[PDB]
Design an enzyme around this catalytic site. Structure first.
Site, PDB file in Angstrom:
ATOM      1  N   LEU A  42      71.527  54.404  41.396  1.00 42.36           N
ATOM      2  CA  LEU A  42      72.077  55.544  40.682  1.00 42.36           C
ATOM      3  C   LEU A  42      72.084  56.769  41.587  1.00 42.36           C
ATOM      4  O   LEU A  42      71.384  56.817  42.601  1.00 42.36           O
ATOM      5  CB  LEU A  42      71.279  55.844  39.412  1.00 42.36           C
ATOM      6  CG  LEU A  42      70.960  54.681  38.473  1.00 42.36           C
ATOM      7  CD1 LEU A  42      69.897  55.087  37.472  1.00 42.36           C
ATOM      8  CD2 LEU A  42      72.215  54.227  37.755  1.00 42.36           C
ATOM      9  N   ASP A  43      72.892  57.754  41.216  1.00 36.59           N
ATOM     10  CA  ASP A  43      72.979  58.999  41.962  1.00 36.59           C
ATOM     11  C   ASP A  43      72.150  60.075  41.263  1.00 36.59           C
ATOM     12  O   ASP A  43      71.417  59.802  40.309  1.00 36.59           O
ATOM     13  CB  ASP A  43      74.440  59.402  42.135  1.00 36.59           C
ATOM     14  CG  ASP A  43      75.228  59.277  40.855  1.00 36.59           C
ATOM     15  OD1 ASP A  43      75.124  58.219  40.201  1.00 36.59           O
ATOM     16  OD2 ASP A  43      75.952  60.227  40.504  1.00 36.59           O
ATOM     17  N   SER A  44      72.248  61.316  41.746  1.00 39.63           N
ATOM     18  CA  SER A  44      71.429  62.389  41.196  1.00 39.63           C
ATOM     19  C   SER A  44      71.817  62.714  39.758  1.00 39.63           C
ATOM     20  O   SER A  44      70.944  62.947  38.914  1.00 39.63           O
ATOM     21  CB  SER A  44      71.537  63.635  42.074  1.00 39.63           C
ATOM     22  N   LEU A  45      73.119  62.723  39.457  1.00 38.58           N
ATOM     23  CA  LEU A  45      73.561  63.078  38.111  1.00 38.58           C
ATOM     24  C   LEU A  45      73.035  62.093  37.075  1.00 38.58           C
ATOM     25  O   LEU A  45      72.700  62.483  35.950  1.00 38.58           O
ATOM     26  CB  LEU A  45      75.085  63.157  38.058  1.00 38.58           C
ATOM     27  CG  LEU A  45      75.751  64.072  39.085  1.00 38.58           C
ATOM     28  CD1 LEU A  45      76.624  63.278  40.029  1.00 38.58           C
ATOM     29  CD2 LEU A  45      76.563  65.149  38.393  1.00 38.58           C
ATOM     30  N   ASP A  46      72.960  60.809  37.430  1.00 40.14           N
ATOM     31  CA  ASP A  46      72.381  59.829  36.518  1.00 40.14           C
ATOM     32  C   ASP A  46      70.912  60.132  36.252  1.00 40.14           C
ATOM     33  O   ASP A  46      70.436  59.987  35.120  1.00 40.14           O
ATOM     34  CB  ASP A  46      72.546  58.421  37.085  1.00 40.14           C
ATOM     35  CG  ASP A  46      73.993  57.986  37.150  1.00 40.14           C
ATOM     36  OD1 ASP A  46      74.850  58.675  36.560  1.00 40.14           O
ATOM     37  OD2 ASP A  46      74.274  56.951  37.790  1.00 40.14           O
TER      38      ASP A  46
END
Ligand code: CDL
Ligand code: PLX
Ligand code: PEE
Ligand code: PEE
Ligand code: 8Q1
Lengths: 88, 175, 104, 459, 67, 62, 111, 128, 220, 124, 178
Positions: A42-46
């Site tokens: 996952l990325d930061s927004l997730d």
């Protein structure tokens, strides 16, 4: 009376429950020590969305400076325990 | 009761209507009145009877002090200190008496307005006139003396007022 | 002191100060029990304009309504005994001029 | 009235002959006894005063002041014994001696029949206060405070003396009874104007009047606790008592010489109430409160009406009690934390709840909560001023607001909020301090129950 | 009366609270209907409002535009 | 023990207040003033026994 | 002696009893809220009677019981007015206060 | 695009709307690091005494003493009579006095003049 | 007095219709009702003002208790944006609040009807400021507006509170207190109005449209 | 409303003024008018202590209603007929007031129009 | 609250905080859950549209424009959690928090009750007294000669060491003390 004495087992159960309702994460692949960045892809927004889901689940806000560091469900459980003075 | 004079503090003759029931329902006011009487007024009456009986076995009296009249400030020489002292004391006592008179009239006025009810504006006209007259007299006597008032200052005020009214009367005579 | 970050571990959490840092000359004015200078969603002198306009409009409209009153199409109330002359103050030795009301 | 004077002069050798560990007990017990004896003076007549002898007389205005003085001495003794523990025996006896001499001087001052003897005692009260302030105060500012305390008084009081003797060369007497009975109007001349100023400025400085008040914050902050108590409670009332006595020979000049003093008093009332809102020192807040209340009393005395005189007497008594209590309350915290800064020790209600209740009652009485005698005096003065001029209710009204604000401000700054983390030497309140606050506060409500004992001779 | 948390299910309801709520709603509606039946005038008005236009000049006594 | 509350909190205060009003407050004039009762036509006065006449033969606009 | 005045004064006087009992061995227990609620309910029931008397007859009284102090010509006394407004507002306020206190016995349990 | 927000004295500019924060330079970073270092040094100095078991009393804060001394005892030595200082002092210390004096003198003169003419309606005005 | 009352009631009613804290909405409703009381005083009807005081005490206090019951149920939460479907979860609270909102809005033959309806009819038939009359009418519309807002956001729709359901109102004290105030807010208007003597002169002749003015604006 | 719009937008010269009214003699248009009478004497109305504003021409019905209310105290729903009668008398009073307003409006407009017509005729 | 702040915030941190604030205020605007989910997905799309901009100047310009838009379109009355700094229960229980050192001033009669609790308190006090000097020496060694540059504190490293400056953090009163 008031709310029951929240315990560590309950906190872990709720964290895992909310995590297993997220579509971008496989339920079986998830463990209490799973990493959101490396293991899960996952990325930061997730991560931000998961933190907001935690806040909505437990009804209190986690400051951003403390929120960015949390990366695994164990860290979330520990943080909620320390904020709420749960020892058992 | 006989504790106070009924002429200084007058009252109307207390006319009240007889109770005329019109419903077959009971009147809870009367029932509560009977309960209150039987439960409160009787023990209170008995305690009062006991206290008065105890008081009657030891009866003593106190008397109202009488003051004679001494020469006024008008009959006082310029530096006769003793006569001025006596006149000043007499003046202060008279001032207190006048204050109490005004208080009595005010009590009359206040009691009447409440008693009259909704017709106080017409019914209380007699009380209002008496208060206006006594208030005018009191204001002509003692108002504007200020602190450090004395019999000499009241005498000076009266002399000024009589000089003014004499001048006004003499000027109106020539009209 | 309201503008300061509430999530920092201040030495004095209530005053939002730290030990040793310089204190503002007007700190007691800004103790956050008092004058607050924090930013607002709507800019100053725009809230001022709206509030002043509302108050001025209401005052002018109330004045207009006072000069343009609302009433029912009726005559004045009629009272039997010379407009209740004796009831509103008495004076029974003055022979006040008679007021008469007629049927309609 | 030597039955009150001689027991104090007997307190002197009793203190100087007591054991090293029984000075406080003996002094407190016998000062309480002397206060109880002096309580009998409240039985006053309605026409004249109690003329005991050719030299002493007691009126309905001075009797409450004597009772307050005699009641304040044991309170000063109880407040002083905490910070005087390390002192030597001789110096403790000297301190008690200074307090006893101050009480004796005040007792004779409030009952002197002649203006010259009153002046002599009213000036003799300076020496014990100056010695106490300049010797037993804590910081280096005390010395300067002492100077500001001394000359500010003398520069206003020395001309009065000249005026006094001049009067005796004209009227032939300075006895208050002869002066009252043989009063004559004062003409409109420059000589009479300057005689008015000479007779008034001393008491104006002692109140103090706004603009002449710069000595008060220094003296009341730098002095020890008993010094502050005696300065705020009784020594400020000497000016009011003297002005009330002396205004009998100044009419009708006052009718127009009261203007600048009235304007100064009202505007300075507003100004000092405003100053109290921004103060970093807790003692200075109480000092400026005292200035505002004394400005109110000055206005009342200047307008010269029976209602204003009654309100002035009531406000004098009530303010004495209130300011003494507030000074003691501040001194407890100072003894705990050794610093006068107000924002230093916060949230004290969590650690000291009964002291929080005492703070609350003192602050409520300060802002004139009904039906306290504070409010009775303030409201009587307000009504008298409204009769004097309808516009006054504006300025008074402003003060009636601002006062309340700063009062509650003080409370909320010290008792509410959260405790300071690093202050851990805050011990539970001693019985001595609680008894001190209780003995300050209970007489206030008791006098509220019977308010005719402090309303003066005009009642 | 012991009721435990539910966690994303409808809360446990005791019969007494529903009985009380229904009874009080029903009694409010009964009172409204009864009072409207017996005190209708307080809502629709009691007396007719007259129209001044339908008043003749004989009773109003205005002269016929001559005197 | 059961109904001692109504004795020590209602009966005693009302006894004391009734005593104080009946024998001390009433002892001085104009301390308890009540507005006069309303008099309507057709009434009879308790003390004097006087009866109030009827009301002027209503027009009876039935 | 016309129970209107006595009941009106008793309604006000019995509300002050718990204030005096606040330094007794009832403030230090867990029965004080119940005691206060019972006191206020009893006061409401007592005040219900003068309202009935006024409704039946229309009685209005003033009671100047204690003379506090007297000025030169102004006399200040402790006087209560028990007209229609007082005898109508007192029962309503007492009823609402009783209900609020019973609600608080549940709301502020953890305080 | 959207309406602009303009800050005031009593409604300041938000941190996220400040142009001076979106245009940064390495010297700004150095300044921020120095500020953080100063703050961290002060925090450590405070915490060493705060956690000391043997410390009993109040930790003296030189900042508080400096603030109080500046607000109270340092004002007169640093005062100079300037046209601004003199004008503000004369205005704020004299103007209110004369303004109120004029107001009250006018009010009292009008009241007295009405009293002399005998038309003030002083009926029932017993207490003064 | 009349102008001050009119401006107060209109401004507070306008501020109430957009608030999200339930306590703030009830507070602004209280302020608007006080403004209406001041308006009633301003048209020389003090007895109507006192009657309205007595009437409004009941349902205002009971509305605040209902809000407090909701707040204590959902872990001290006061925002209406996070209170969901409580119509069935809190039946007694729902019933009480519905009755109280109806009484506040001058529903016929309830408690608030016997005072507010008379107040509106009295201000309609008076020689008064026209702006004040218009503001009183707009305020009495906004009253129904904010009551609708409260009911719609707090008791209808789907849940929005946190999933750990702690809803429980089965406590004898809360039920008994709310039931007492509910019986009061249903019958006290009739009981008091029928038991007081007439201290006012009534408005007997009114146009039909003006008679239903309060009802019309409330429905709109 | 309509009279308000008529006065505040149309011709106010022919519109009645509520403060200054009536501007015509009471017997102007009428040949003879009966003096309005009263059923309650001043003394009875004083002993009843109604109010200063309740002492209108319909005071007798109020007095009877109050007497019945006092007599029928515990049954507070028995005073209906006399309350209705008082309401009816107040309604009649209001109708008379409306008649007075209409009379004044018609008289004002007719008088002003007739004077204008007379002036126009004399100017021809 | 627990973590030591840094000297500055990075651009990624600013973007993440803007994302969180925008989502929260959008939830404040969109009361119902389905509407919030719809517009939250739309907002996420808007955010990840420019996710791959290599020019930092244009990235900061977009961040500036987004901040301005958010300030213009913010909710005047956003939702705040009850115990958050703007909430209705923020500092509610601060009056019930009493420091532990207060127990040192209890009367011996009071301490007669709760004997075991005060025995444990004595054990904790002894632990603090023995560990203080080792914590002090560890702090000195770890810190750079030019003073500390951050508020972070080192942990324990030796056999039976304790993390320096631990007493007042570990012995917090409570979150719900009374
Ligand atoms: C109407 C009341 C009837 C009462 C009958 C009995 C009266 C006895 C009076 C005795 C003197 C009062 C006590 C003084 C010292 C304080 C005692 C104390 O240390 O308490 C700790 C003790 C133990 O508690 P704790 O667990 O240690 O508490 C820890 C903290 O301290 C926490 O403690 P806390 O938070 O509980 O704080 C204590 C509490 C109470 O403590 C106090 O504040 C006491 C002082 C009150 C304020 C006074 C300053 C303002 C001016 C008032 C002047 C009134 C004078 C009346 C004459 C008094 C003569 C003695 O604080 C308050 O509640 C705030 C008071 C606000 C009062 C508002 C009303 C103002 C006056 C209204 C009119 C008064 C006249 C009515 C008649 C008018 C005509 C109908 O508790 C008590 O002693 C009982 C408290 C009772 C509170 C009563 C407050 C109202 C009293 C007003 C005057 C009563 C006049 C009585 C004569 C008849 C009238
Ligand atoms: C920080 C605060 C300190 C305390 C302040 C104390 C206040 C003292 C002020 C004294 C009050 C007034 C003094 C004299 C009374 C009248 C003053 C004057 O303005 O009135 C006119 C006076 O006219 C002119 O002013 C002439 C006097 C001018 C000389 C005075 C100096 C004024 C300049 C201000 C100096 C500030 C003084 C304080 C220094 C610290 C009236 O004209 P006139 O009718 O003919 O004189 C009346 C006397 N008669 C009847 C015997 C003839
Ligand atoms: C009559 C003479 C005086 C008239 C009043 C004139 C204005 C008075 C100004 C008082 C200044 C006092 C300064 C120090 C006060 C203490 C500090 C203080 O109160 O802090 C401000 C505090 C904090 O603000 P919050 O919104 O609550 O924020 C909390 C969440 N963060 O809020 C306040 O208390 C502000 C109160 C100031 C009000 C001043 C303006 C009022 C003007 C009213 C005039 C209208 C008259 C009405 C006429 C009615 C018709 C007859
Ligand atoms: C405790 C319960 C005791 C039970 C036994 C008591 C039984 C009856 C006792 C009767 C005692 C005799 C008596 O009361 O007579 C009246 C007697 C003398 O008459 P005065 O009016 O005081 O004289 C004028 C000068 N003030 O008055 C009294 O001594 C009793 C006073 C108590 C009154 C009730 C309490 C009122 C005071 C409360 C504080 C008021 C503060 C200021 C209020 C200002 C109001 C404007
Ligand atoms: C409700 C009213 C308020 C709503 C108004 C707000 C709407 C604003 C919408 C526009 C905002 C943007 O697009 S601003 C887009 C800014 N563009 C860039 O940042 C490009 C460089 N990429 C990165 O910095 C990282 O990849 C990063 C993207 C942070 C991902 O972080 P992670 O993957 O490591 O977690």
């Amino acid at each position: 009376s008031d709310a029951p004495p929240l315990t560590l087992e309950a906190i872990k159960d709720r964290v895992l429950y909310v995590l297993k309702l997220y579509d971008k994460i496989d339920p079986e692949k998830l463990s209490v020590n799973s990493h959101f960045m490396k293991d899960l892809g996952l990325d930061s927004l997730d991560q931000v969305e998961i933190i907001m889901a935690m806040e909505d689940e437990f009804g209190f806000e986690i400051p951003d400076i403390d929120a960015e560091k949390l990366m695994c469900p164990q860290e979330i459980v520990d943080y909620i325990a320390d904020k709420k003075d749960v020892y058992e | 009761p006989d504790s106070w004079d009924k002429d200084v503090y007058p009252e109307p003759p207390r006319r009240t209507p007889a109770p005329a029931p019109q419903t077959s329902l009971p009147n809870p006011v009367t029932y509560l009145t009977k309960i209150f009487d039987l439960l409160v007024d009787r023990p209170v009456t008995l305690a009062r009877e006991f206290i008065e009986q105890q008081h009657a076995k030891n009866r003593y009296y106190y008397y109202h002090r009488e003051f004679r009249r001494v020469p006024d400030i008008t009959e006082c020489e310029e530096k006769d200190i003793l006569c001025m002292f006596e006149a000043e004391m007499q003046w202060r006592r008279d001032y207190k008496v006048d204050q109490e008179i005004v208080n009595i009239i005010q009590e009359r006025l206040k009691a009447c307005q409440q008693r009259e009810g909704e017709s106080y504006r017409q019914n209380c006209a007699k009380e209002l006139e008496q208060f206006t007259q006594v208030s005018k007299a009191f204001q002509d006597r003692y108002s504007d003396l200020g602190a450090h008032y004395s019999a000499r200052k009241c005498l000076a005020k009266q002399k000024q007022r009589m000089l003014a009214e004499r001048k006004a009367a003499k000027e109106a005579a020539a009209a | 002191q309201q503008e300061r970050d509430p999530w920092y571990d201040w030495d004095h959490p209530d005053l939002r100060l730290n030990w040793g840092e310089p204190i503002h000359w007007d700190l007691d004015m800004y103790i956050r029990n008092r004058v607050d200078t924090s930013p607002t969603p709507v800019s100053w002198n725009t809230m001022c304009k709206h509030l002043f306009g509302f108050v001025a409009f209401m005052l002018f409209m109330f004045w207009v309504g006072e000069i343009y009153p609302s009433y029912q199409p009726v005559g004045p109330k009629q009272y039997p005994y010379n407009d209740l002359y004796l009831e509103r103050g008495g004076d029974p030795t003055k022979e006040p001029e008679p007021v008469v009301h007629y049927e309609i | 009235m030597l039955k009150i004077i001689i027991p104090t002069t007997m307190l002197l050798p009793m203190t100087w002959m007591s054991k090293h560990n029984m000075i406080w007990i003996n002094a407190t017990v016998h000062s309480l006894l002397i206060s109880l004896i002096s309580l009998s003076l409240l039985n006053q007549l309605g026409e004249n005063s109690l003329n005991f002898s050719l030299t002493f007389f007691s009126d309905s205005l001075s009797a409450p002041l004597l009772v307050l003085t005699t009641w304040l001495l044991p309170l000063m003794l109880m407040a002083s014994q905490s910070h005087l523990s390390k002192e030597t025996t001789t110096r403790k006896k000297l301190y008690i001696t200074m307090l006893i001499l101050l009480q004796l001087f005040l007792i004779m001052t409030f009952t002197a029949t002649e203006l010259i003897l009153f002046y002599i005692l009213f000036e003799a009260t300076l020496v014990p206060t100056l010695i106490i302030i300049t010797r037993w105060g804590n910081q280096t500012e005390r010395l300067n405070a002492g100077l500001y305390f001394l000359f500010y008084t003398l520069a206003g009081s020395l001309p009065l003396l000249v005026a006094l003797v001049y009067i005796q060369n004209t009227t032939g007497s300075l006895n208050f009874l002869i002066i009252h009975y043989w009063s004559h109007p004062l003409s409109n001349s420059w000589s009479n104007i300057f005689m008015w100023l000479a007779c008034i400025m001393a008491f104006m400085v002692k109140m103090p009047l706004y603009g002449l008040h710069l000595w008060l914050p220094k003296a009341h902050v730098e002095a020890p606790i008993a010094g502050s108590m005696v300065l705020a409670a009784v020594l400020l009332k000497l000016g009011g008592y003297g002005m009330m006595r002396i205004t009998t020979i100044l009419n009708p000049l006052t009718n127009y010489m009261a203007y600048p003093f009235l304007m100064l008093s009202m505007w300075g009332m507003i100004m000092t109430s405003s100053i109290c809102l921004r103060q970093t020192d807790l003692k200075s807040l109480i000092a400026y409160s005292s200035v505002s209340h004394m400005a109110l009393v000055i206005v009342a005395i200047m307008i010269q009406t029976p209602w204003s005189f009654m309100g002035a007497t009531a406000l004098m008594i009530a303010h004495g009690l209130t300011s003494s209590m507030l000074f003691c309350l501040a001194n407890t915290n100072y003894e705990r934390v050794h610093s006068r800064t107000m924002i230093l020790a916060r949230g004290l209600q969590t650690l000291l709840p009964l002291m929080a209740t005492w703070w609350l009652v003192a602050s409520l009485t300060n802002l004139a909560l009904p039906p306290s005698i504070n409010l009775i005096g303030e409201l009587f003065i307000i009504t008298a001023s409204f009769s004097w001029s309808n516009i006054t209710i504006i300025l008074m009204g402003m003060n009636m607001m601002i006062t309340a604000l700063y009062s509650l401000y003080m409370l909320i700054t010290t008792q509410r909020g959260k405790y300071t983390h690093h202050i851990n030497n805050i011990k539970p309140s001693f019985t001595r301090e609680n008894a001190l606050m209780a003995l300050h506060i209970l007489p206030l409500l008791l006098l509220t129950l019977n308010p005719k004992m402090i309303l003066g001779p005009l009642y | 009366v012991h009721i435990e948390p539910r966690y994303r299910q409808f809360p446990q309801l005791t019969r007494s609270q529903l009985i009380q709520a229904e009874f009080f709603s029903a009694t409010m509606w009964f009172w409204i209907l009864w009072r409207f039946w017996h005190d209708s005038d307080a809502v629709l008005g009691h007396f007719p409002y007259p129209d001044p236009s339908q008043w003749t000049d004989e009773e109003l006594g205005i002269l016929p535009d001559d005197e | 023990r059961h109904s001692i509350f109504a004795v020590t909190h209602v009966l005693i205060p009302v006894w004391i207040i009734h005593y104080y009003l009946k024998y001390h407050v009433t002892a001085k004039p104009y301390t308890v003033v009540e507005r006069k009762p309303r008099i309507f036509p057709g009434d009879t006065i308790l003390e004097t026994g006087e009866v109030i006449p009827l009301m002027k033969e209503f027009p009876d606009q039935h | 002696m016309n129970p209107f005045a006595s009941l009106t004064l008793t309604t006000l006087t019995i509300l002050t009893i718990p204030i005096m009992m606040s330094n007794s061995n009832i403030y230090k227990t867990n029965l004080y809220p119940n005691y206060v609620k019972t006191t206020v309910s009893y006061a409401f029931t007592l005040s219900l009677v003068p309202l009935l008397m006024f409704m039946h007859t229309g009685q209005e009284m003033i009671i100047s019981n204690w003379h506090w102090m007297t000025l030169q010509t102004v006399e200040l006394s402790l006087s209560f007015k028990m007209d229609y407004f007082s005898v109508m507002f007192i029962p309503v306020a007492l009823f609402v206060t009783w209900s609020i206190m019973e609600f608080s016995m549940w709301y502020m349990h953890s305080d | 695009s959207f309406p602009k927000y303009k800050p005031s004295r009593l409604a300041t500019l938000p941190a996220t709307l400040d142009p001076a924060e979106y245009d940064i330079s390495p010297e700004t970073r150095k300044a921020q690091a120095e500020r953080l270092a100063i703050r961290s040094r002060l925090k450590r100095e405070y915490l060493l005494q705060y956690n000391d078991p043997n410390r009993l009393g109040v930790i003296e804060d030189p900042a508080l003493i400096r603030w109080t001394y500046a607000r109270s005892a340092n004002i007169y030595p640093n005062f100079r009579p300037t046209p601004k200082t003199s004008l503000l002092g004369a205005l704020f210390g004299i103007g209110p006095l004369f303004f109120w004096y004029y107001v009250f003198k006018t009010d009292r003169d009008k009241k007295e003049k009405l009293i002399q003419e005998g038309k003030l309606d002083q009926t029932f005005n017993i207490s003064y | 007095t009349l102008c001050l009352g009119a401006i107060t009631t209109l401004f507070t009613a306008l501020c109430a219709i957009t608030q999200n804290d339930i306590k703030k909405i009830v507070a602004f409703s209280t302020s608007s009702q006080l403004g209406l009381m001041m308006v009633t005083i301003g048209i020389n009807q003090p007895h109507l003002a006192f009657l309205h005081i007595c009437m409004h005490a009941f349902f205002k206090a009971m509305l605040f208790m209902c809000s407090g019951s909701i707040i204590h149920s959902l872990n001290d939460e006061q925002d209406i944006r996070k209170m969901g479907g409580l119509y069935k979860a809190m039946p007694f609270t729902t019933t009480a609040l519905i009755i109280g909102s109806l009484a506040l809005t001058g529903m016929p033959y309830l408690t608030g009807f016997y005072s507010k309806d008379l107040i509106i009819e009295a201000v309609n038939m008076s020689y008064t400021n026209a702006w004040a009359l218009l503001m009183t009418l707009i305020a009495t519309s906004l009253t129904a507006a904010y009551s609708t807002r409260i009911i719609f956001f707090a008791f209808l729709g789907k849940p929005r509170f946190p999933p750990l359901v702690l809803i429980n109102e089965n406590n004898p004290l809360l039920i008994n207190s709310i039931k007492r105030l509910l019986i009061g807010s249903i019958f006290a208007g009739f009981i008091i109005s029928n038991n007081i003597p007439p201290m006012t002169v009534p408005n007997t002749t009114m146009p039909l449209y003006m008679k239903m003015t309060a009802l019309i604006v409330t429905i709109m | 409303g309509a009279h308000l719009a008529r006065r505040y937008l149309g011709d106010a010269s022919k519109e009645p003024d509520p403060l200054r009214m009536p501007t015509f003699p009471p017997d102007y248009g009428f040949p003879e008018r009966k003096e309005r009478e009263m059923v309650a004497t001043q003394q009875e109305m004083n002993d009843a202590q109604l109010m200063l504003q309740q002492r209108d021409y319909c005071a007798h019905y109020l007095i009877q209603l109050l007497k019945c209310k006092r007599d029928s105290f515990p049954n507070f729903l028995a005073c209906k007929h006399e309350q209705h009668d008082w309401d009816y008398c107040e309604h009649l009073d209001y109708v008379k007031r409306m008649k007075e307003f209409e009379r004044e409006r018609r008289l004002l407009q007719r008088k002003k129009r007739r004077e204008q017509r007379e002036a126009e005729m004399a100017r021809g | 609250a627990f973590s030591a702040p840094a000297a500055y915030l990075t651009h990624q941190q600013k973007v993440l905080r803007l994302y969180k604030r925008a989502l929260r205020h959008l939830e404040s605007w969109c009361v119902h859950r389905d509407k919030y989910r719809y517009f939250a997905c739309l907002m996420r799309a808007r955010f990840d549209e420019h996710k791959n901009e290599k020019d930092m100047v244009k990235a900061t310009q977009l961040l500036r424009q987004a901040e301005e838009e958010f300030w213009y379109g913010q909710h005047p009355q956003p939702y705040i959690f009850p115990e958050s700094p703007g909430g209705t229960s923020y500092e509610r229980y601060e009056c019930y928090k009493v420091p532990e050192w207060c127990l040192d001033d209890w009367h011996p009669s009071e301490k007669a009750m709760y004997p075991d609790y005060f025995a444990k308190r004595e054990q904790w006090k002894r632990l603090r007294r023995e560990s203080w000097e080792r914590e002090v020496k560890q702090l000195q060694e770890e810190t750079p000669p030019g003073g500390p540059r951050t508020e972070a504190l080192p942990p324990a490293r030796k056999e039976g060491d304790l993390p320096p400056l631990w007493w007042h953090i570990v012995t917090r009163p409570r979150e719900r003390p009374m």
